[PDB]
């Protein structure tokens, strides 16, 4: 199609191929929505080619892509209003990631990242997250927002609120965390779980639509790995690190107490203790103003 309608052939071909940068993006997201568990390897091959093409189109037609991208964001917002999480699909997770691929994630303000980040903050908080299918969605969401701020390293409160409920969800309450608002009390992990086997932390997206204990544990570890990375990158520089990690530390302490064998809560706790020891918690000084002549 690009070869048949290059700019040089005739007038208006430039405007057309701009609309195909848009149409390609919808096709890329549409293909992700389609079932692909049968031919994941081939479906991987066809995808990265299409994304590579869309990257070339965006380089020349970033304007038309952004227009389609924002129209999608408006569309998904509208679908969220009426259907809540039922509107969400695997394609949305694909959409926001292609935005990360094709747009400057590390900007104070961007035409597509800012709506994408603020839109992502809503699913992290508004949604109930009462099912394993739903929790798997947030873990992918948490991953994307974290790398949206990989260089910027800006603080997202919805990221903090997310781990607190999910961490408490898999321990259901212990009667010590009343400040955390849970939405499902029936997802508590059984005590008999080993937590010593080598369980892969990767969450397939084709399974996300289809959605037992093993899957819950893998989701928990992936969320915990995101938590540990977030401590190691963002919160450590933030002046309120001690108070940020205190509710998380109490939850992590509960994880160790209930599951002594489970090592991830102990490691993250040990790193936290190291950061708190090194970080110098001094009274804040911000009103020191420059004298005027």
């Amino acid at each position: 199609i690009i070869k048949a309608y290059q700019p040089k052939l005739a007038e208006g071909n430039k405007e057309k191929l701009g609309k195909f940068t848009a149409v390609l993006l919808r096709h890329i997201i549409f293909l992700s929505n389609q079932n692909y568990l049968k031919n994941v390897q081939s479906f991987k091959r066809t995808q990265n080619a299409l994304i590579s093409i869309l990257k070339s189109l965006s380089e020349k037609y970033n304007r038309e892509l952004s227009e389609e991208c924002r129209d999608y964001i408006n569309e998904m917002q509208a679908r969220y209003k009426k259907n809540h999480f039922d509107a969400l699909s695997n394609g949305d997770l694909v959409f926001f990631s292609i935005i990360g691929i094709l747009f400057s994630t590390s900007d104070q303000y961007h035409l597509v990242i800012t709506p994408a980040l603020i839109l992502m903050s809503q699913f992290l908080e508004q949604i109930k997250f009462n099912s394993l299918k739903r929790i798997a969605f947030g873990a992918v969401l948490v991953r994307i927002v974290s790398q949206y701020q990989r260089i910027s390293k800006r603080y997202i409160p919805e990221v903090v609120y997310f781990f607190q409920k999910i961490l408490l969800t898999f321990i259901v309450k212990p009667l010590d965390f009343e400040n955390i608002r849970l939405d499902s009390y029936e997802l508590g992990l059984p005590l008999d779980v080993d937590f010593t086997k080598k369980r892969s932390t990767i969450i397939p997206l084709h399974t996300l639509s289809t959605m037992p204990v093993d899957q819950c544990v893998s989701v928990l570890l992936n969320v915990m790995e995101s938590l540990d990375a977030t401590i190691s990158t963002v919160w450590k520089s933030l002046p309120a690190f001690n108070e940020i990690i205190l509710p998380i530390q109490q939850l992590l302490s509960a994880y160790t107490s209930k599951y002594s064998d489970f090592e991830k809560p102990r490691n993250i706790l040990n790193k936290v203790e190291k950061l708190t020891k090194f970080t110098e918690h001094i009274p804040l000084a911000l009103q020191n103003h420059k004298p005027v002549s």
Binding site: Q287, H289, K290, P291, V292, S293
Partner: protein
């Protein structure tokens, strides 16, 4: 350990004026300023630009250099102590004219515009701001003594006088008092022009100092001594 004051917002320190005598302040007197005007339009007499004219007047053109006063004013005016509002400047012309310089003024950096301001000042006896709210440069009645603070110490810059440390000097002086320096803007001459007013003359160094350098060197001592930064 202490609660902050009611209002921490920095406010501009008061602009010192001759009327106020209580506040501790820095006084620098650029004594013997060579500022003269003559109709050719009136022009500030210069050593280089005008040589035949001053020869006709019979004045030694070696003592015909107003730029020395310009640089001393420039380095003095821009000093941080002026930005802190703790320094106020007087100029005693060789003719006997006393000029009061408001700290708020911003004299031109180039000499040519500086000369234009002197001739306007000397003829009109005062200079008004662009916004027309205060008289930045005003000629005042001699002697200098009445204008100076009621309690104040007077010193001159003397090459032959004993070398002192400006910072140690200002510290050992009292607080309620003020300090006056009488700087000789002349290129070369005897240091007795302020003998009648001063009580003791101090040397800032052994090696010779330029007028601007001595003013700059001296005021740094007050800022370090007074923690003006």
């Amino acid at each position: 350990q202490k609660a902050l004051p009611a209002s921490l917002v920095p406010q501009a320190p008061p602009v010192l004026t001759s009327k106020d005598k209580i506040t501790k302040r820095m006084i620098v007197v650029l004594a013997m300023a060579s500022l003269e005007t003559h109709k050719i339009k009136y022009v500030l007499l210069n050593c280089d630009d005008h040589q035949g004219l001053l020869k006709k007047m019979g004045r030694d053109i070696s003592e015909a250099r107003p730029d020395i006063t310009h640089q001393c004013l420039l380095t003095l005016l821009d000093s941080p102590i002026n930005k802190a509002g703790k320094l106020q400047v007087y100029i005693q012309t060789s003719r006997g004219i006393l000029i009061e310089v408001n700290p708020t003024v911003r004299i031109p950096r180039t000499f040519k515009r500086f000369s234009g301001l002197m001739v306007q000042l000397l003829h009109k006896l005062s200079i008004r701001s662009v916004n027309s709210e205060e008289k930045l440069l005003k000629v005042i009645k001699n002697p200098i003594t009445d204008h100076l603070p009621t309690k104040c110490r007077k010193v001159t810059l003397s090459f032959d006088a004993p070398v002192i440390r400006v910072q140690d000097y200002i510290e050992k002086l009292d607080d309620d008092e003020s300090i006056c320096v009488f700087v000789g803007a002349m290129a070369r001459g005897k240091d007795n022009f302020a003998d009648e007013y001063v009580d003791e003359k101090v040397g800032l160094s052994n090696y010779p100092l330029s007028a601007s350098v001595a003013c700059s060197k001296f005021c740094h001592g007050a800022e370090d001594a007074w923690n003006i930064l």
